[PDB]
Amino acid sequence: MKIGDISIHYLNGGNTKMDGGAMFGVVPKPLWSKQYNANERNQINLPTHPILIQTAQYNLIIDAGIGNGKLSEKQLRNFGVDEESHIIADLANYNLTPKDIDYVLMTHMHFDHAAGLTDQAGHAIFENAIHVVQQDEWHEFIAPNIRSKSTYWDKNKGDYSNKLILFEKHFEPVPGIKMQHSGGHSFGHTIITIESQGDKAVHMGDIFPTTAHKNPLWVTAYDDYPMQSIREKERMIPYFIQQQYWFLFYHDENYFAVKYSDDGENIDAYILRETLV
């Protein structure tokens, strides 16, 4: 993928199998099962593939996958992990090492996105990288309630917190990369946009998980504030489409990106996610 001078790729940070009903909330199964595949256990396959962004000067990732040795044996099974992260080997394919990374931008701190931030002993994969998190997202991450406790794990704390930078509403790390507090899925959930030359790309995190969640009303049950999720989706998606943005995905098993035609119905351009088995 290329957006102007910026190169965009995905990294195999592992995968998870989550219950379809929970990933589609109010949408009846008969309808969502036709848009996304589920197994005998009502689980749909959700890759956890970080997004590698390379500008002329900086290298950065959008999330960190499920890591290596982080999830227990019970969690690996309960979360349908087929394979753990291959983020090191994948990075090599681009002549990079978990040390040439300058920024790790987080959409949110749920385990499916932050487990791969540190190895065991909570050291920290990505030692020279500055880590950016929305301030309230971070606050809840370290002080989760009886509900967010299930995904915000102490086990995911670590050294990276040394080079931690917090932002409230918006933040532009390196030119062209803009983070923006969306809320909805998470109180501190963030979306990221990439712009180089005239090209535009956007990753709406878990506020637009997969291509099957394009309908603003189709939000996951995980969303702590679904009304805010809908609000954001109702306005962002039509705008990004009108502006001919490329939609990047972290969880979609089939596609890595998509560009809808100036209409809002037909998504002509789908960039397939060729994940090695």
Q: Of the ranges 6-14, 115-123, 192-200, 230-238, which one interacts with a second copy (CB under 8 A)?
A: 230-238
Comparing CB distances to a second copy, the nearer of 157 and 231 is: 231
Q: DSSP 3-state assignment of 204?
A: coil
Least gap, CB of 85 to a second copy (angstroms)? 23
Helical (H) or strand (E) element with 270: strand 269-272
Work out whether 245 is an interface residue with a second copy (CB under 8 A): no
Instruction: Determine contact, residues 101/11, Cβ cutoff 8 Å.
Output: no
Candidate residues 9, 155, 157, 231; the one interacting with a second copy per rule CB under 8 A:
231
Least gap, CB of 142 to a second copy (angstroms)? 8
Work out whether 126 is an interface residue with a second copy (CB under 8 A): no
Residue 199 amino acid letter: D
Work out whether 168 is an interface residue with a second copy (CB under 8 A): yes
Q: Note the residue count of the chain.
A: 277
Here's the x/- map for a second copy, 74-113, by CB under 8 A: it reads as ----------------------------------------
DSSP per position, 160-227:
GGGGEEEESSEE-SSTTEEEEE--SSSTT-EEEEEEETTEEEEE-GGGS-SGGG-STT---TT-S-HH
Q: Under 8 Å CB-to-CB from 125, ≥6 apart: which residues? A: 64, 67, 87, 98, 116, 117, 118, 119
The Cβ of residue 246 has, within 10 Å, a number of other Cβ atoms equal to 21
Q: Two tokens at 105?
A: 């931008």
The Cβ of residue 77 has, within 10 Å, a number of other Cβ atoms equal to 10
Work out whether 144 is an interface residue with a second copy (CB under 8 A): yes
Residues from 30 through 49 that contact a second copy (CB under 8 A): 30, 41-43
Helical (H) or strand (E) element with 48: none
Work out whether 29 is an interface residue with a second copy (CB under 8 A): yes
Candidate residues 126, 153, 167, 256; the one interacting with a second copy per rule CB under 8 A:
167
Q: Under 8 Å CB-to-CB from 70, ≥6 apart: which residues? A: 115, 116, 118, 119, 120, 155, 156
Work out whether 170 is an interface residue with a second copy (CB under 8 A): no
Q: Residue 38 has what DSSP assignment? A: B
Q: Two tokens at 102?
A: 């300058």
Work out whether 230 is an interface residue with a second copy (CB under 8 A): yes
Candidate residues 74, 121, 146, 276; the one interacting with a second copy per rule CB under 8 A:
146
Comparing CB distances to a second copy, the nearer of 90 and 112 is: 112
Least gap, CB of 206 to a second copy (angstroms)? 13
Q: Which residues bind a second copy (CB under 8 A)?
A: 19-22, 24-30, 41-43, 130, 135, 139, 143-147, 163-168, 216-217, 221-222, 224-227, 230-231, 234-235, 238-239, 242
